[PDB]
């Protein structure tokens with residue numbers, strides 16, 4: 088159900104400044120994930136996006152959704168297994184139906200809601216939304232392949 | 237509420253030393269409630285510590301001092317970016333600080349400061365930092381606002 | 385309106401700055417039609433510290449972002465030409481992204497070339513599609529709809 | 537136990553890393569009693585981008601941090617001597633901070649000297665107090681309690 | 689010993705890391721004789737934040753550094769071949785630099801090509817000289833002497 | 841003036857983080873010599889890569905700090921402490937020669953730049969000297985620069 092940063096670090100190979108999931112609040116195998124990233128001014132991204140107007144990049148929202156969806160796919164098949172995690176990689180083949188509705192800014196808790204749309208073998212198609220305070224800020228569908236590292 | 241854009245117009249602190257994201261409550265000469273989001277995507281966590289992200293205790297205090305500073309700026313001159321842009325903030329004293337619970341990525345670090353005493357530019361504040369309604373830290377501090 | 389633009393000119397048009405300005409040079413520009421630009425990929429970028437240790441792969445979403453910035457440069461200059469003063473008052477936003485395909489990984493040493501074509505434009509609304517290429521090969525494809533909005 | 541330690545020795549004892557390793561050299565050390573150490577202050581530090589633009593002032597809270605790290609080096613080597621294999625699985629938590637006064641701003645070009653004395657220690661819990669100094673003058677006073685803990 | 693090496697190979701031979709690994713790819717290598725390598729130059733490098741605001745220019749001294757690293761890669765693979773096991777036990781020290789000329793500024797979007805030849809070598813001491821080139825034009829010249837030393 | 845602090849250096853040199861490599865000027869004699877320094881601390885980004893577990897201040901950046909000191913000397917010799925004119929000038933370094941590194945520089949070192957004017961003819965300034973740590977010569981270099989409009 089709940090995974091904290093330490094758990095996340097053992098599953099995902101992403102490190103600073105490209106690990107964009109802070110906590111997993113909900114996880115149903117083969118079904119859905121709810122996770123989040125806290126948004127703060129204290130992030131290097133905001134130096135350039137943009138000067139005097141801090142806006143969390145929309146592509147990094149999608150990236151966070153992908154990272155959530157990849158975590159869903161991996162743990163669905165192998166559970167919380169750091170040893171297997173090092174032998175596998177989840178890369179993203181496609182991204183589709185992306186819509187941005189509301190700008191994300193420092194102070195926002197950026198929540199990722201992804202469900203498994205379909206899966207066959209190592210090909211997993213996830214989809215859902217990014218949410219701040221109950222509102223949809225973005226949506227996206229993503230297709231991942233799981234492979235050997 | 238004051239948002240990051242408003243905070244930037246008052247506090248002189250910038251990246252990577254601006255440690256308040258939003259002001260939720262402000263009562264002139266009385267108290268302030270504010271917060272900073274804690275995320276893994278912060279440079280500090282590279283060194284504090286490897287494989288063990290713990291938000292530095294001294295930076296909790298700094299975030300409290302900045303919250304106190306916002307309260308000080310605005311109690312003094314109201315929301316005035318023009319006056320603000322000439323000033324900086326010096327730490328004078330820190331006392332009676334206790335850390336109870338570690339602060340980690342995914343935490344909403346909420347600052348609760350009240351005015352203990354003030355005179356001119358010298359402001360003494362005290363209160364707590366909280367995560368999910370729990371006190372993670374206590375501190376008292378005195379800061380001075382000065383011309384740049 | 386020129387067809388070649390260097391970083392000096394890109395900085396005057398785009399509001400993006402480090403570490404989110406992801407276009408280094410523009411090699412072809414045809415108003416309301418197309419842009420060919422590129423970003424150099426080097427190990428000396430902070431992004432590779434995290435993506436990934438011992439295995440530097442340029443993030444696919446940053447390829448898309450770089451395509452969007454190229455598209456945004458094209459959109460603005462198609463309407464106002466090289467006008468830094470007005471550029472300073474405008475900002476281009478992503479509305480949608482569709483049909484994104486990652487074909488080949490991008491790595492240090494690569495010259496990431498953005499090829500964007502104008503699919504539709506009406507006023508401030510611009511639909512662009514195209515590819516990111518390395519040494520003549522398609523590494524990514526994307527379509528996006530952008531909005532030229534007020535900065536304030 | 538030696539009395540002088542260099543950055544290599546510090547790295548082998550303290551768990552802190554960039555951008556939070558704030559002790560550069562140890563000049564004297566008496567086990568269970570005192571430590572004198574220092575950190576060089578240069579404009580070439582990332583903190584100075586934010587504290588403050590056009591007026592670089594080394595943050596007071598980081599002076600306290602460096603004093604704590606000095607006490608933590610003293611604490612560890614007093615416990616286990618110079619043992620990097622024991623050290624690499626330890627971390628250090630701040631417990632309390634009291635009676636800190638900042639007297640003089642610290643700026644680029646300063647050699648920030650930490651002088652800590654052990655006020656009380658019991659097991660992993662070390663209470664140190666002292667001063668930070670620049671050119672023989674007290675820029676800061678501080679009392680603090682830190683706990684050494686096994687990473688778990 | 690092959691002729692082309694990519695970033696993952698360079699990582700395994702050179703001890704340099706971010707932000708001081710300034711070679712992205714090796715295109716040509718003749719043991720004990722010469723090397724052609726390059727670094728891509730992008731705006732997305734932290735160094736351009738300070739060199740200079742509103743005018744990105746790749747520092748001349750860092751061009752020399754990239755040439756030394758190219759020389760160092762040549763030096764090591766000449767003596768040990770592609771041996772990551774032994775590469776881990778070594779660093780490189782600059783001993784001398786001579787005859788350096790800066791002819792053309794290097795900017796974002798440039799492919800910085802390093803051409804170095806061995807002038808003299810004995811044991812760990814390697815003397816190299818050559819040019820840095822962008823689009824076939826000489827941007828810089830330098831001679832340098834380096835030593836491969838045991839990490840101890 | 842004879843002594844300049846970081847505030848003054850920022851107003852004369854266009855260099856900024858992470859390429860401003862002079863922290864303070866302790867001596868300045870117009871047309872003759874400059875003594876300046878940069879503090880070396882582990883808390884610098886360069887040390888992440890140069891090298892892991894063995895922090896060594898890059899030799900090329902010693903030379904760079906010497907060049908910066910030479911440029912400050914040249915500029916202040918021509919116009920003194922003038923931030924307004926500073927914004928309109930560049931000091932372009934054309935050549936570097938006779939550089940030798942004797943002792944590695946590490947966190948905790950006070951890197952002192954000793955530079956003197958070797959030749960000044962029109963826009964061309966030729967400067968040379970040493971970098972020192974605790975009175976010992978750690979590096980030496982000669983440099984030639986040209987004054988020009990920004």
Ligand SMILES: COc1cc(O)c2c(c1)O[C@H](c1ccc(O)cc1)CC2=O
Pocket residue numbers: 100176177178179236436439441486487488489490
């Ligand atoms: C351990 O090696 C890795 C790790 C990754 O995160 C990734 C990878 C390889 O490569 C993935 C990829 C990207 C593009 C492509 O055409 C084929 C695969 C993208 C990715 O996220």
Ligand SMILES: COc1cc(O)c2c(c1)O[C@H](c1ccc(O)cc1)CC2=O
Pocket residue numbers: 740743745852853854907908911912915926929930931932933990
């Ligand atoms: C006080 O005036 C100075 C001093 C310098 O050292 C320098 C300078 C101006 O400006 C030079 C410069 C060179 C090229 C450019 O596009 C912008 C600035 C770099 C330099 O080292």
Ligand SMILES: [Cl-]
Pocket residue numbers: 142143144145146478
């Ligand atoms: Cl965006």
Ligand SMILES: [Cl-]
Pocket residue numbers: 290291292293294628629630
């Ligand atoms: Cl702490």
Ligand SMILES: [Cl-]
Pocket residue numbers: 441442443444445
């Ligand atoms: Cl990717």
Ligand SMILES: [Cl-]
Pocket residue numbers: 325326327593594595596597
């Ligand atoms: Cl302070």
Ligand SMILES: [Cl-]
Pocket residue numbers: 746747748749
């Ligand atoms: Cl240069």
Ligand SMILES: [Cl-]
Pocket residue numbers: 780781782896897898899900
């Ligand atoms: Cl060196």
